[PDB]
Each structure stands twice: as structure tokens, then as C-alpha cells.
Amino acid sequence: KKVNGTSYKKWSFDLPEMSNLYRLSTPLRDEVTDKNYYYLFDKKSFFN
Amino acid sequence: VSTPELKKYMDKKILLNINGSRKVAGILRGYDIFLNVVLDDAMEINNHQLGLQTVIRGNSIISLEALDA
Amino acid sequence: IESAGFETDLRLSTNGLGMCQLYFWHKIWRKVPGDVLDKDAFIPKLKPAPINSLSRDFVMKTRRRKG
Amino acid sequence: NGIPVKLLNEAQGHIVSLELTTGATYRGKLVESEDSMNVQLRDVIATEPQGAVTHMDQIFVRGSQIKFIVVPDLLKNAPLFK
RNA sequence: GGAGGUCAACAUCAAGAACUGUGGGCCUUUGCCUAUAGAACUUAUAACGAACAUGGUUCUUGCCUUUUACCAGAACCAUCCGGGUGUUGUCUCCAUCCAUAUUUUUUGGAACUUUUC
RNA sequence: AUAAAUUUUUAAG
């Protein structure tokens, strides 16, 4: 269930796992929860 | 279940074509879900009026063709 | 005339939280605090003019654009 | 609910033909129909069982006394049935 | 016959918002119009890669004795580390729809007799 | 009532 096989592509998980992984990764997580935070920092504002 | 939409015909004179090749006339005053008709009276079609107001049973009505537009 | 930059001022200053909309319906109007005809009005020259005369400014400008 | 009823409802607007128990065919724009086939029609001609025809404005008919209703053949196409 | 493989080969992946086949009509195959069937993968804050390098030519600069090596922008092109889907082959592990009768439907107002044709 | 930050080295002649 959890993975394709030994060729090891196309991972699939369940909710509780992703809960724990989501918990452990907090120091590297992006942490910004909304698009509107980027206002003049998106790409098109940099090109412009 | 649903009400017969005769609110267009309210307070207008109607030819109530009724059972047994008979007729009635008169201005429409009311009705119900069984299509009984309450109407202010007129003649039976030469011609002769009976009553001041009249009530026609639902089953008896063949048609109620509007005299007024 | 004061709203030239308003929206972005707001939307940045709050760090993206917030919003603004500017709309014109009631067609209200208002006096500009200056006195339209005065010789002594202060022309700031690259500064926003002082409120004592903004009208002598606006008129002395529009008349220069028109003719 | 009855699919014939649905069909009748759909036919609203269109020129339906309509015979009764008496055998008095009508043909007109179907104004309104109900679950009980309580039809109203506009601009309606009215044939007698013997032969003679009579024009009339806004006929109402009670489905009890209706025999059969002819609807236009465009409704055959769509999209009530499936 | 099923599951797989850090296996292979051959297709296809940047466009009129776009694919292919087929039926019918006109011109004379192309092409236009009309009818019909199926469309995997990739695309709208646009793209196969939720990532990110280098090279060539041509201009503009920057360092500034000259050339490699360079400074940072543009245009046109390429190379390179990777990827998806489809078909086939091969290899490994296993198996031979209401429930009920009193005005709109199904508890009927049906029948008998007579004339014309 | 300001928060604005360029570089940087080797060979040959």
C-alpha cells in the first residue's frame, strides 16, 4: 500500500503519518499560510 | 395536491361546460383543490337564470371556458 | 486627488492583512480649503501645498494646462 | 412521478391537440398543466363530435374528462426521457 | 494468468487553445462545408523538472597594456543533469419501491331499445 | 520619523 515497490516511485500515504511528518518538519516548514502575504514579493513583481 | 391555477379567471364570467351536454354561466368567486367552483349566478343554456349565487361540484365540470378574455 | 496611492499604502502597511475599496456613488463634493483667487498663496515648488491654499494652487495649475 | 405528466408540462408553450371523453377535439398553445392533467390552452379551436368547428380564446380542461393529448413531435427529441 | 523490476527497445511530449479516425456534399488528391466515434501525458500567477547549470554568435557595458579567464543585461540559438504517458519484449516471485375503495385516473354512469346507412 | 551596502583570480606575452 505505502509505495509502488522496489523501483520506488509514486509514494502514497495515510492521514496519521502525514500528521506526524507534518509535526516533525516544523523547523524547515514554509510556515506562511496565505497567498496574500506575498504582495510585492511574487515573481511578477520582481520581473516588473 | 397542487391548487388549480384559476387566479387568472377570478372575478370573470365563465362558461362552465358541465356533465350531460349541459352548460352554466357566471362570474367566478372561488374554488378548491378538487376544482369545485363558487360563482355569482347566471343562466343555464332559450335561457333562464336560477339562484343568486351558485356552487358547481368538481366532478361535474367538463370545461370552464372563459367568456371574458 | 489624495487617493492616488492609498490602496497599496494600506495593503502593504498591514503586511497583507486588510483591504480597501474606493468608490464613487453619492456624487458628494466638497470645498477645497483654499481661496480660489489670491495673489499671496504659497507655491511650495515640489512639496504638497499647505492647506491654507490648495485651491489657488489647483486653479493656477489647471489654468496652465488649459491655457 | 409520471413521465407523461412531465411530458405534458414540457409541452407548455407548444400547440397541443386535445380530445375529451365527449369527443370534442381542441388544438392550442398549452398555457398551464398540473399533475392531474388540468390543462389550460390559448387561441384554441374546438371541433364538435359531429363535425362543426368553433374558435375560442382561453379554454380550461380537467384531466378527468380528457381522453388523449397530442404534443408536437419536436419534444420526442429531448431531454426528459434521458 | 497476477504482482512487481533503480530492465530494454520503439513511439509521443509546447500548439488556430491547439488531437486523431470515420460518414456525407462541393472543387478538382489537396482544400472547404457538414455528420459521427475516441481523446493517455503536459499546460493559466501558463508547463514535461513544484527543480536549475554551461556553451556559441551578435550587440550594449564593466574591469582596463594585449589574449585566454572575466564583470551584467539583451536577442537569437544549442549542449547537459533529469521526467511523464503509451505499446512491445525480457527478467524475478507466486499459481495451473407504499398498503388499501367516498370528486382528477384502478371500485367506473353502466346497459337496454330504435332509426338511417 | 531611516530601515536602500559595488567588488574579490590564474596562465602567457
Ligand SMILES: [Mg+2]
Ligand atoms: Mg602579441
Ligand SMILES: [Mg+2]
Ligand atoms: Mg616574446
